[PDB]
Protein backbone atom coordinates (compact mmCIF):
# COMPACT_ATOMS: atom_id res chain seq x y z
CA UNK A 1 0.00 0.00 0.00
CA UNK A 2 2.94 2.35 -0.73
CA UNK A 3 3.94 4.08 -3.97
CA UNK A 4 7.08 3.50 -6.03
CA UNK A 5 7.32 6.19 -8.71
CA UNK A 6 9.39 5.29 -11.83
CA UNK A 7 12.70 7.02 -12.69
CA UNK A 8 13.52 9.24 -15.70
CA UNK A 9 14.84 6.89 -18.40
CA UNK A 10 16.17 9.17 -21.16
CA UNK A 11 14.18 8.02 -24.19
CA UNK A 12 15.14 8.74 -27.81
CA UNK A 13 11.96 10.88 -28.09
CA UNK A 14 12.11 12.81 -24.79
CA UNK A 15 12.95 16.43 -25.72
CA UNK A 16 10.64 19.16 -27.06
CA UNK A 17 11.70 18.62 -30.70
CA UNK A 18 12.77 14.96 -30.30
CA UNK A 19 11.02 12.44 -32.59
CA UNK A 20 10.24 8.75 -32.19
CA UNK A 21 12.87 6.14 -33.10
CA UNK A 22 11.13 4.42 -36.05
CA UNK A 23 13.55 1.44 -36.07
CA UNK A 24 12.87 1.04 -32.33
CA UNK A 25 9.14 1.21 -33.17
CA UNK A 26 9.80 -1.43 -35.86
CA UNK A 27 11.29 -3.77 -33.25
CA UNK A 28 8.70 -2.69 -30.66
CA UNK A 29 5.89 -3.84 -32.97
CA UNK A 30 7.58 -7.25 -33.35
CA UNK A 31 7.67 -7.45 -29.53
CA UNK A 32 3.89 -6.86 -29.42
CA UNK A 33 3.23 -9.30 -32.27
CA UNK A 34 5.46 -12.08 -30.93
CA UNK A 35 5.02 -11.61 -27.16
CA UNK A 36 2.13 -9.28 -26.13
CA UNK A 37 -0.35 -10.17 -28.93
CA UNK A 38 -1.35 -13.58 -27.44
CA UNK A 39 -2.79 -12.05 -24.23
CA UNK A 40 -3.36 -8.31 -24.87
CA UNK A 41 -5.85 -6.36 -26.95
CA UNK A 42 -4.79 -3.49 -29.20
CA UNK A 43 -8.15 -2.44 -30.61
CA UNK A 44 -7.41 0.96 -32.20
CA UNK A 45 -4.48 0.06 -34.53
CA UNK A 46 -4.55 -1.54 -38.00
CA UNK A 47 -1.76 -2.77 -40.28
CA UNK A 48 -2.12 0.31 -42.54
CA UNK A 49 -1.09 2.53 -39.57
CA UNK A 50 2.30 0.74 -39.66
CA UNK A 51 2.83 1.84 -43.30
CA UNK A 52 5.30 4.74 -43.54
CA UNK A 53 6.01 4.61 -39.79
CA UNK A 54 7.96 1.38 -39.24
CA UNK A 55 7.15 -0.71 -42.37
CA UNK A 56 6.47 -0.37 -46.11
CA UNK A 57 3.04 -0.98 -47.68
CA UNK A 58 4.13 -4.38 -49.05
CA UNK A 59 5.78 -5.46 -45.78
CA UNK A 60 2.78 -4.30 -43.74
CA UNK A 61 0.40 -6.09 -46.15
CA UNK A 62 2.39 -9.34 -45.77
CA UNK A 63 2.05 -9.13 -41.97
CA UNK A 64 -1.68 -8.55 -42.24
CA UNK A 65 -1.86 -11.53 -44.63
CA UNK A 66 0.06 -13.72 -42.13
CA UNK A 67 -2.90 -13.72 -39.72
CA UNK A 68 -6.39 -14.88 -40.72
CA UNK A 69 -9.56 -13.04 -39.60
CA UNK A 70 -13.35 -13.27 -39.93
CA UNK A 71 -15.43 -11.71 -42.70
CA UNK A 72 -19.05 -11.94 -43.90
CA UNK A 73 -21.84 -12.71 -44.13
CA UNK A 74 -21.48 -14.70 -47.38
CA UNK A 75 -24.28 -15.63 -49.84
CA UNK A 76 -25.25 -18.70 -47.76
CA UNK A 77 -25.75 -16.41 -44.72
CA UNK A 78 -22.77 -17.38 -42.58
CA UNK A 79 -19.29 -16.17 -41.61
CA UNK A 80 -15.93 -17.37 -42.93
CA UNK A 81 -12.20 -16.71 -42.46
CA UNK A 82 -9.83 -14.91 -44.84
CA UNK A 83 -6.18 -13.76 -44.76
CA UNK A 84 -5.78 -10.30 -43.21
CA UNK A 85 -5.32 -6.98 -44.97
CA UNK A 86 -4.02 -3.41 -44.46
CA UNK A 87 -7.54 -2.27 -43.41
CA UNK A 88 -7.93 -5.00 -40.72
CA UNK A 89 -7.41 -3.93 -37.12
CA UNK A 90 -5.07 -6.07 -34.97
CA UNK A 91 -6.66 -9.42 -33.89
CA UNK A 92 -8.17 -9.32 -30.39
CA UNK A 93 -6.90 -12.29 -28.30
CA UNK A 94 -10.32 -13.25 -26.82
CA UNK A 95 -13.93 -12.53 -27.91
CA UNK A 96 -14.75 -10.52 -24.71
CA UNK A 97 -13.51 -9.35 -21.25
CA UNK A 98 -15.13 -12.35 -19.46
CA UNK A 99 -13.09 -14.78 -21.62
CA UNK A 100 -9.95 -12.86 -20.57
CA UNK A 101 -10.78 -13.14 -16.86
CA UNK A 102 -11.62 -16.82 -17.48
CA UNK A 103 -8.29 -17.41 -19.25
CA UNK A 104 -6.15 -15.42 -16.77
CA UNK A 105 -7.03 -16.01 -13.09
CA UNK A 106 -9.92 -13.50 -12.92
CA UNK A 107 -7.73 -10.66 -14.26
CA UNK A 108 -8.39 -8.51 -17.35
CA UNK A 109 -5.27 -7.81 -19.46
CA UNK A 110 -5.93 -4.18 -20.52
CA UNK A 111 -5.89 -2.69 -24.02
CA UNK A 112 -2.37 -1.57 -25.07
CA UNK A 113 -3.45 1.07 -27.63
CA UNK A 114 -3.53 3.90 -25.05
CA UNK A 115 -1.71 2.24 -22.09
CA UNK A 116 1.13 4.82 -22.13
CA UNK A 117 -1.37 7.72 -21.99
CA UNK A 118 -3.70 5.73 -19.67
CA UNK A 119 -1.18 5.26 -16.81
CA UNK A 120 0.82 7.79 -14.76
CA UNK A 121 4.48 7.88 -15.85
CA UNK A 122 3.87 6.30 -19.25
CA UNK A 123 6.89 4.62 -20.87
CA UNK A 124 8.92 5.06 -17.65
CA UNK A 125 6.19 3.14 -15.77
CA UNK A 126 5.72 0.50 -18.50
CA UNK A 127 9.51 -0.02 -18.78
CA UNK A 128 9.94 -0.23 -14.97
CA UNK A 129 6.98 -2.66 -14.81
CA UNK A 130 8.48 -4.97 -17.47
CA UNK A 131 12.14 -4.95 -16.41
CA UNK A 132 11.48 -4.35 -12.67
CA UNK A 133 10.12 -7.80 -11.73
CA UNK A 134 11.77 -9.06 -8.52
CA UNK A 135 11.29 -11.42 -5.56
CA UNK A 136 8.72 -10.73 -2.79
CA UNK A 137 10.44 -9.54 0.42
CA UNK A 138 10.02 -11.13 3.87
CA UNK A 139 6.39 -10.77 4.99
CA UNK A 140 4.90 -10.40 1.50
CA UNK A 141 3.15 -13.74 0.98
CA UNK A 142 1.23 -13.49 -2.31
CA UNK A 143 -1.60 -15.84 -3.34
CA UNK A 144 -2.28 -18.02 -6.43
CA UNK A 145 -2.06 -16.42 -9.90
CA UNK A 146 -0.01 -13.45 -8.62
CA UNK A 147 3.57 -12.21 -9.02
CA UNK A 148 5.54 -9.56 -7.13
CA UNK A 149 6.37 -6.38 -9.01
CA UNK A 150 7.01 -3.25 -6.89
CA UNK A 151 6.12 -0.58 -9.51
CA UNK A 152 2.55 -1.97 -9.84
CA UNK A 153 0.15 -0.14 -7.40
CA UNK A 154 -0.97 -3.18 -5.34
CA UNK A 155 2.53 -4.79 -5.43
CA UNK A 156 0.82 -8.06 -6.55
CA UNK A 157 0.45 -8.14 -10.34
CA UNK A 158 -1.64 -10.85 -12.06
CA UNK A 159 0.72 -10.98 -15.07
CA UNK A 160 3.52 -13.51 -15.45
CA UNK A 161 6.80 -11.85 -16.36
CA UNK A 162 6.12 -11.29 -20.04
CA UNK A 163 9.63 -10.62 -21.39
CA UNK A 164 12.99 -12.22 -20.55
CA UNK A 165 16.37 -12.39 -22.33
CA UNK A 166 15.90 -13.43 -26.01
CA UNK A 167 12.19 -14.31 -25.79
CA UNK A 168 12.20 -13.31 -29.49
CA UNK A 169 14.75 -12.51 -32.23
CA UNK A 170 14.78 -9.21 -34.13
CA UNK A 171 14.81 -9.19 -37.95
CA UNK A 172 17.49 -6.45 -38.22
CA UNK A 173 19.94 -8.55 -36.12
CA UNK A 174 19.79 -6.65 -32.82
CA UNK A 175 20.77 -8.27 -29.48
CA UNK A 176 17.39 -9.26 -28.00
CA UNK A 177 18.12 -8.63 -24.30
CA UNK A 178 15.30 -8.11 -21.75
CA UNK A 179 15.86 -4.35 -21.35
CA UNK A 180 16.39 -3.91 -25.13
CA UNK A 181 12.98 -5.57 -25.65
CA UNK A 182 11.41 -3.32 -22.98
CA UNK A 183 13.00 -0.25 -24.61
CA UNK A 184 11.74 -1.07 -28.12
CA UNK A 185 8.17 -2.07 -27.14
CA UNK A 186 7.75 1.02 -24.92
CA UNK A 187 8.96 3.12 -27.88
CA UNK A 188 6.20 1.36 -29.90
CA UNK A 189 3.45 1.68 -27.23
CA UNK A 190 4.20 5.43 -27.22
CA UNK A 191 3.44 5.48 -30.95
CA UNK A 192 0.30 3.32 -30.53
CA UNK A 193 -1.06 5.85 -27.99
CA UNK A 194 0.26 8.95 -29.80
CA UNK A 195 0.86 8.38 -33.55
CA UNK A 196 0.78 12.19 -34.12
CA UNK A 197 3.95 12.48 -31.91
CA UNK A 198 6.52 13.32 -34.64
CA UNK A 199 4.33 15.60 -36.73
CA UNK A 200 3.10 17.40 -33.60
CA UNK A 201 6.67 18.28 -32.48
CA UNK A 202 7.49 19.60 -35.98
CA UNK A 203 4.43 21.86 -35.72
CA UNK A 204 5.84 22.72 -32.29
CA UNK A 205 9.18 23.86 -33.75
CA UNK A 206 7.43 25.81 -36.50
CA UNK A 207 5.07 27.39 -33.93
CA UNK A 208 7.96 28.47 -31.66
CA UNK A 209 9.89 29.87 -34.64
CA UNK A 210 6.80 31.68 -35.97
CA UNK A 211 5.77 33.01 -32.54
CA UNK A 212 9.41 34.10 -32.10
CA UNK A 213 9.07 36.01 -35.38
CA UNK A 214 5.61 37.53 -34.81
CA UNK A 215 5.46 38.51 -31.09
CA UNK A 216 8.13 41.23 -31.45
CA UNK A 217 6.73 42.37 -34.85
CA UNK A 218 3.21 42.74 -33.37
CA UNK A 219 4.58 44.28 -30.15
CA UNK A 220 6.51 46.73 -32.39
CA UNK A 221 3.26 47.74 -34.15
CA UNK A 222 1.58 48.18 -30.75
CA UNK A 223 4.49 50.35 -29.56
CA UNK A 224 4.58 52.27 -32.86
CA UNK A 225 0.87 53.12 -32.48
CA UNK A 226 0.83 53.82 -28.71
CA UNK A 227 4.01 55.99 -29.07
CA UNK A 228 1.79 59.05 -29.74
CA UNK A 229 0.31 58.81 -26.22
CA UNK A 230 3.39 57.41 -24.42
CA UNK A 231 5.56 60.42 -25.40
CA UNK A 232 2.83 63.08 -24.95
CA UNK A 233 3.26 65.99 -22.55
CA UNK A 234 0.39 67.66 -20.63
CA UNK A 235 0.58 71.41 -19.92
CA UNK A 236 -1.92 73.11 -17.58
CA UNK A 237 -2.36 76.86 -18.20
CA UNK A 238 -5.22 78.44 -16.21
CA UNK A 239 -6.01 82.19 -16.40
CA UNK A 240 -5.76 84.77 -13.59
Amino acid sequence: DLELHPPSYPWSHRGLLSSLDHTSIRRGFQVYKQVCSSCHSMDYVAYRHLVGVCYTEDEAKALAEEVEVQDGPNEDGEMFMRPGKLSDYFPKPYPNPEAARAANNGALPPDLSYIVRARHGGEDYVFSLLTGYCEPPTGVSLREGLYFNPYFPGQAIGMAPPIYNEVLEFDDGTPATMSQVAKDVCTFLRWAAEPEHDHRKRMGLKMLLMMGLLLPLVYAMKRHKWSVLKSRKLAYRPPK
Binding site: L2, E3, A220, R223, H224, K225, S227, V228, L229, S231, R232, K233, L234, A235, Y236, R237, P238, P239
Partner: protein
Protein backbone atom coordinates in the same frame (compact mmCIF):
# COMPACT_ATOMS: atom_id res chain seq x y z
CA UNK B 1 -21.55 58.74 -24.30
CA UNK B 2 -19.54 59.85 -27.33
CA UNK B 3 -16.46 61.94 -28.13
CA UNK B 4 -17.85 65.44 -27.57
CA UNK B 5 -20.33 64.59 -24.78
CA UNK B 6 -17.93 62.95 -22.24
CA UNK B 7 -17.08 65.79 -19.81
CA UNK B 8 -16.07 69.43 -19.30
CA UNK B 9 -12.27 69.90 -19.60
CA UNK B 10 -10.68 73.38 -19.52
CA UNK B 11 -7.24 75.03 -19.83
CA UNK B 12 -5.29 71.84 -20.72
CA UNK B 13 -2.79 71.52 -23.60
CA UNK B 14 -1.64 68.16 -25.01
CA UNK B 15 1.57 68.10 -27.10
CA UNK B 16 1.86 64.95 -29.24
CA UNK B 17 4.16 63.62 -31.97
CA UNK B 18 3.66 61.48 -35.10
CA UNK B 19 4.61 57.79 -34.69
CA UNK B 20 6.72 58.00 -37.87
CA UNK B 21 8.55 61.09 -36.53
CA UNK B 22 9.31 59.43 -33.16
CA UNK B 23 10.85 56.13 -32.04
CA UNK B 24 8.98 52.94 -31.13
CA UNK B 25 11.32 51.71 -28.34
CA UNK B 26 12.77 54.92 -26.78
CA UNK B 27 15.23 54.10 -23.95
CA UNK B 28 13.78 50.63 -23.39
CA UNK B 29 16.55 48.86 -21.43
CA UNK B 30 17.99 52.23 -20.31
CA UNK B 31 14.98 53.70 -18.43
CA UNK B 32 12.75 50.60 -18.36
CA UNK B 33 14.66 47.99 -16.31
CA UNK B 34 14.96 50.47 -13.37
CA UNK B 35 11.25 51.37 -13.71
CA UNK B 36 10.36 47.65 -13.84
CA UNK B 37 12.46 47.07 -10.71
CA UNK B 38 10.84 50.05 -8.90
CA UNK B 39 7.38 48.63 -9.70
CA UNK B 40 8.51 45.21 -8.44
CA UNK B 41 9.71 46.77 -5.15
CA UNK B 42 6.38 48.62 -4.75
CA UNK B 43 4.20 45.49 -5.12
CA UNK B 44 6.42 42.59 -3.83
CA UNK B 45 5.66 43.13 -0.11
CA UNK B 46 1.89 43.01 -0.74
CA UNK B 47 1.93 40.26 -3.41
CA UNK B 48 4.60 37.69 -2.45
CA UNK B 49 4.12 36.66 1.24
CA UNK B 50 0.81 34.82 0.65
CA UNK B 51 2.44 32.76 -2.16
CA UNK B 52 5.45 32.13 0.12
CA UNK B 53 2.98 31.01 2.83
CA UNK B 54 1.33 28.76 0.21
CA UNK B 55 4.74 27.26 -0.65
CA UNK B 56 5.46 26.62 3.07
CA UNK B 57 2.06 24.96 3.65
CA UNK B 58 2.46 23.09 0.31
CA UNK B 59 5.87 21.50 0.96
CA UNK B 60 5.04 20.90 4.65
CA UNK B 61 1.70 19.27 3.80
CA UNK B 62 3.27 17.05 1.14
CA UNK B 63 6.17 16.26 3.53
CA UNK B 64 3.73 15.35 6.32
CA UNK B 65 1.65 13.31 3.84
CA UNK B 66 4.77 11.29 2.89
CA UNK B 67 5.67 10.86 6.60
CA UNK B 68 2.17 9.50 7.38
CA UNK B 69 2.23 7.25 4.25
CA UNK B 70 5.43 5.51 5.41
CA UNK B 71 6.00 2.98 8.25
CA UNK B 72 6.12 3.79 11.95
CA UNK B 73 8.38 2.32 14.68
CA UNK B 74 5.48 1.36 17.02
CA UNK B 75 4.12 -1.13 14.43
CA UNK B 76 4.54 -4.35 16.45
CA UNK B 77 8.08 -3.49 17.70
CA UNK B 78 9.09 -4.58 21.21
CA UNK B 79 6.06 -6.91 20.72
CA UNK B 80 6.80 -10.41 19.35
Amino acid sequence: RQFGHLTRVRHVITYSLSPFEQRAFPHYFSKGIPNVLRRTRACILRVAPPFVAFYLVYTWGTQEFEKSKRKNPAAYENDR
